[PDB]
């Protein structure tokens, strides 16, 4: 019943957005666009970029387009807006007051089923087992994690009750590690590094203020409807 | 000291942004980008456009021309600019507790305006020069429910250090800048904006319908894109 929605702005048009770089050990599989700013395209590595048709690039690993800060107009200003909007979201998520849960599990989320609400830790958070979100289709969850976030190899996030990963946001102060073959659901608003380890998957988006490393990793972001034109 | 700044988001990258069309009787001079969305480029008229499928250029425009039918990422870039312009219009219309309510019953004759929030529930006219007197951090917002019209040849003048990046006008009905008149500030218009023969504007024009220029100048502040890290 609390509306903990986090407004992403232009950053909802990206599967992965990073300030410093994105790397892939191939083959990753990303559904949605990816972008870096203020970094140049040289900090997007392991993708085999082919530049078009000089505003964006393509890769067999990305279903969508790839954007960097040195590409042609209007890409620099589009990216600037996406990164500014992603910072405003991080801050909004970190800014909500009066948590429903404080230091749950003393930082460890083991065999948990999480009702909707605002969850805060001043520590790092680890997820050694599967994790279930239970709530309806409009329910919202925000995690405020001052430290790192780590998911053990093979753990999976499960949705129950009608829940949608568009309504799940994780704000994390320190590095995020999604373990090998683990499955994440939600929007990751990371202050520092995010690594999706070998053969992990994420339905949601990855928004980092530094670098994103993919290891044979899958990211499926929501469809972006094309603005409809008046002729 | 009330901070009446209006946040423009992506609309600070446009000299003129309009939902339905932009026209020019040439030669106009626009310093800054122009864009229409959701309208197609066929609703940008009089610019002698030349089409890199993401934008067009014109001798009248220092910058780029964008339309909703142009190629990726122009449609999503424009949809952000228009959404951000609407959010700005609603923020300016939403400020509460005006400092000055119905000044002049809508007619601003020989006025010098200290900083603050000005509201009218009527239309407004500016039959003479109008001065804004305040320092370089002072902010003004005008909330006008009706139209806004400037008489021929009048000017908006800046005294005491005033800066027109800190002046915003929210106007519900048509805005008409008379021949040879001079406007200062950000115009957030719900409906039509006409800059008549030889008028000029230091600021931006953000319209929810159409903008028409007649041998007119729109000179917008340039906001640098992030410096590239190589």
Curated annotation (Swiss-Prot), chain B:
This protein's GO CC annotations: extracellular region
Positions glycosylated per UniProt? 163
Q: What GO molecular function annotations does the UniProt record carry, in alphabetical order?
A: ice binding
Give the free-text PTM comment from the record. Glycosylated. Glycosylation is not required for the thermal hysteresis (TH) activity. Glycosylation may increase stability and secretion of this protein.
Residue stretches spanning the membrane: none
Q: What is the effect of changing residue 194 to Y?
A: Has 59% thermal hysteresis (TH) activity of that of the wild-type
Free-text biotechnology note from the record: Improves cryopreservation of the human red blood cells (RBCs). Almost 90 % hemolysis damage induced to RBCs by freeze thawing with the slow warming at 22 degrees Celsius is dramatically decreased to less than 16 % when 0.4 or 0.8 mg/ml of this protein is used as a cryoprotectant. The post-thaw cell counts of RBCs frozen in the presence of 0.8 mg/ml of this protein and thawed by slow warming at 22 degrees Celsius is almost the same as that of non-frozen intact RBCs, whereas the recovery of RBCs frozen in its absence is less than 30 %.
Q: Which UniProt keywords apply?
A: Antifreeze protein, Glycoprotein, Secreted, Signal, Stress response
Question: Domain of life of the organism in this record?
Answer: Eukaryota
Q: Which residues form a coiled coil?
A: none
Q: Give the primary localization class.
A: secreted
Record family assignment? Belongs to the ice-binding protein family.
Summarize the subunit comment.
Homodimer. Dimerization is not required for the thermal hysteresis (TH) activity.
| The protein's name in its UniProt record | Ice-binding protein
Organism per entry = Leucosporidium sp. (strain AY30)
* Primary gene name: AFP
């Amino acid at each position: 019943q609390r509306d903990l929605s986090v407004e992403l702005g232009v950053a909802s048009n990206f599967a992965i957005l990073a300030k410093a770089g994105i790397s892939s050990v191939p083959d990753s599989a990303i559904l949605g666009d990816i972008g870096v700013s203020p970094a140049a395209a040289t900090y997007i590595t392991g993708f085999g970029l082919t530049q078009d048709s000089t505003t964006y690039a393509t890769s067999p690993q990305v279903t969508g387009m790839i954007y960097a800060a040195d590409y042609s107009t209007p890409t620099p200003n589009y990216l600037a807006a996406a990164v500014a909007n992603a910072e405003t979201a991080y801050n909004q998520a970190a800014g909500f007051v009066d948590p429903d849960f404080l230091e749950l599990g003393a930082g460890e989320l083991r065999d948990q089923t999480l009702v909707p609400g605002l969850y805060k830790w001043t520590s790092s958070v680890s997820v050694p087992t599967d994790l279930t979100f239970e709530g309806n289709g409009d329910a919202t969850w925000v995690f405020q994690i001052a430290g790192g976030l780590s998911m053990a190899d093979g753990v999976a996030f499960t949705l129950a009750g009608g829940a949608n990963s568009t309504n799940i946001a994780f704000q994390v102060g320190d590095d995020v590690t999604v373990g090998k073959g683990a499955h994440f659901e939600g929007v990751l608003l990371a202050k520092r590094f995010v690594t999706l380890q070998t053969g992990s998957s994420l339905n949601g988006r990855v928004l980092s203020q530094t670098e994103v490393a993919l290891q044979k990793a899958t990211v499926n972001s929501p469809f972006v409807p094309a603005p409809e034109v008046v002729q």
